[PDB]
């Protein structure tokens, strides 16, 4: 088994699929977690990025990508799986064709806004990510690819998912999507896939308590993300446990994944 997990950001694969990854490794699978939006960023940073850096417990002008890459390596090391850090800039570092930042902070609004931009610029990014994923598929030769469902609709998650769908379709490798966590705790779960693709029936895994423990410990390696993920209740792991319990009231911990298959008449 050669399992390629494609994470949009430095944390998503561990949060959503860390128990699956750890179990795969223990079972003897060759596991590689490739993060798309791990590209190096350097000042000057936008006000919005500087705001995020502060929330992440860094100085505004710190090399946040470096800090997060080190966290990712620590977390994946904990799960005993390999990492690969991609070249694409997180949405907080990207610019529009016109020179404006992609993401902006709006005074008095907690949620960051995305500036409108061309259909072409979106298509081009997905195309580039798909190119890189096709190259990794050639290099790693996975028997299975898993990436995010993009529940929560983060643009980076949607770009990752779509590019993975295109690349795996072209290369004829099976693909599954994980339920994005913690997003799925506060979203409906329904997603809109690119034309021609649809989800098959869900699998809800049953993971041994040791795997849950190992996942949760790995999550804690993402120090920069903890305050943000824990919320005003300090209850990330409680919420993840409850979500798992909902989906398997007769079980222990688990993670929901769906196969992606071709739609009828496509
Ligand atoms: C426009 C939103 C800013 C992008 C922030 C990406 C940070 C990673 C957190 C996550 O993976 O969920
Ligand atoms: Zn993410």
- For the chain, the structural domain boundaries read 1-266
User: Considering only CA atoms, which of 8, 234, 3 is closest in space to residue 126?
Assistant: 8
266 Cβ contact partners less than 8 Å away, ≥ 6 residues apart: 195, 196, 197
First CA to last CA distance, the chain = 29
The DSSP bridge pattern shows strands 256-262 and 197-199 to be: antiparallel
Confirm or deny that 162 is annotated as ligand binding.
Answer: no
For residue 97, report the distance from its CA to the centre of ligand 1, in Å: 21
For residue 144, report the distance from its CA to the centre of ligand 1, in Å: 25
Pocket of ligand 1 (CB under 6 A): 9, 11-12, 90-92, 103, 112
What's the CATH code, domain 1-266? 3.40.50.10320
Query: Using N-to-C axis directions, what is the helix angle for 236-247 and 223-230, rounded to 10°?
Result: 70
| Nearest CA owner, ligand 1 atom 11 | 9
Q: Do residues 31 and 3 make contact, with C-beta atoms less than 8 angstroms apart?
A: yes
249 Cβ contact partners less than 8 Å away, ≥ 6 residues apart: none
**How far apart, in whole angstroms, are the C-alpha atoms of residue 251 and residue 249?**
6
Q: Which numbered atom of ligand 1 lies nearest the CA of 228? A: 9
For residue 125, report the distance from its CA to the centre of ligand 1, in Å: 17
DSSP 45-90: PPHHHHHHHHHTTS-TTS-HHHHHHHHHHHHHHHHT-EEEE--PPP
236 CB neighbour count, 10 Å cutoff: 21
**How far apart, in whole angstroms, are the C-alpha atoms of residue 167 and residue 170?**
5
For residue 21, report the distance from its CA to the centre of ligand 2, in Å: 17
Q: Do residues 64 and 224 make contact, with C-beta atoms less than 8 angstroms apart?
A: yes
Query: Using N-to-C axis directions, what is the helix angle for 209-220 and 223-230, rounded to 10°?
Result: 110
Resolution of the deposited coordinates, in angstroms?
Answer: 1.8
Task: Scan for tokens 């500036």, then name that residue.
Answer: 115
**Residue of 111, 156, 221 to mutate, ligand 1, most atoms within 8 A of C-beta:** 156
Confirm or deny that 53 is annotated as ligand binding.
Answer: no
**How far apart, in whole angstroms, are the C-alpha atoms of residue 34 and residue 28?**
19
The DSSP bridge pattern shows strands 82-85 and 103-104 to be: unpaired
**How far apart, in whole angstroms, are the C-alpha atoms of residue 46 and residue 220?**
27
Protein residues with C-beta less than 5 angstroms from the ion ligand 2 = 8-9, 12
109 Cβ contact partners less than 8 Å away, ≥ 6 residues apart: none
Q: How far are the Cα atoms of 20, 89, 129 from residue 136, in angstroms, in the given order?
A: 21, 18, 11
For residue 86, give both structure tokens: 């991609």
């Amino acid at each position: 088994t050669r399992l390629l997990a494609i994470s949009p950001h430095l944390d998503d694969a561990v949060l959503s699929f860390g128990a699956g990854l750890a179990q795969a490794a223990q079972d003897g699978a060759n596991v590689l977690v490739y993060t798309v939006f791990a590209g190096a960023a350097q000042p000057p940073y936008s006000p919005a990025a500087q705001r995020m850096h502060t929330i992440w417990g860094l100085a505004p002008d710190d090399d946040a990508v470096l800090y997060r890459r080190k966290e990712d390596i620590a977390a994946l090391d904990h799960l005993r799986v390999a990492h690969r850090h991609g070249r694409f800039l997180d949405s907080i570092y990207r610019k529009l064709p016109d020179g404006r930042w992609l993401t902006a902070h709006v005074e008095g609004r907690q949620k960051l806004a995305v500036n409108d931009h061309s259909p072409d610029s979106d298509h081009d990014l997905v195309g580039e990510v798909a190119d890189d994923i096709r190259s990794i598929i050639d290099e790693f030769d996975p028997t299975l690819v898993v990436t995010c469902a993009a529940i929560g609709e983060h643009p980076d998650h949607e770009a990752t998912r779509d590019a993975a769908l295109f690349a795996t379709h072209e290369k004829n490798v099976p693909v599954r999507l994980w339920e994005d966590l913690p997003y799925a705790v506060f979203k409906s779960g329904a997603v809109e896939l690119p034309q021609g693709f649809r989800l098959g029936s869900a699998d809800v895994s049953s993971v041994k308590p040791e795997m849950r423990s190992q996942k949760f410990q790995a999550v804690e390696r993402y120090s920069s993300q903890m305050v943000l993920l824990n919320g005003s209740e300090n209850n990330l792991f409680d919420r993840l446990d409850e979500h798992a319990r909902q989906n398997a009231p007769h079980g222990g911990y688990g993670e929901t994944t769906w196969p992606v298959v071709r739609s009828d008449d496509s």
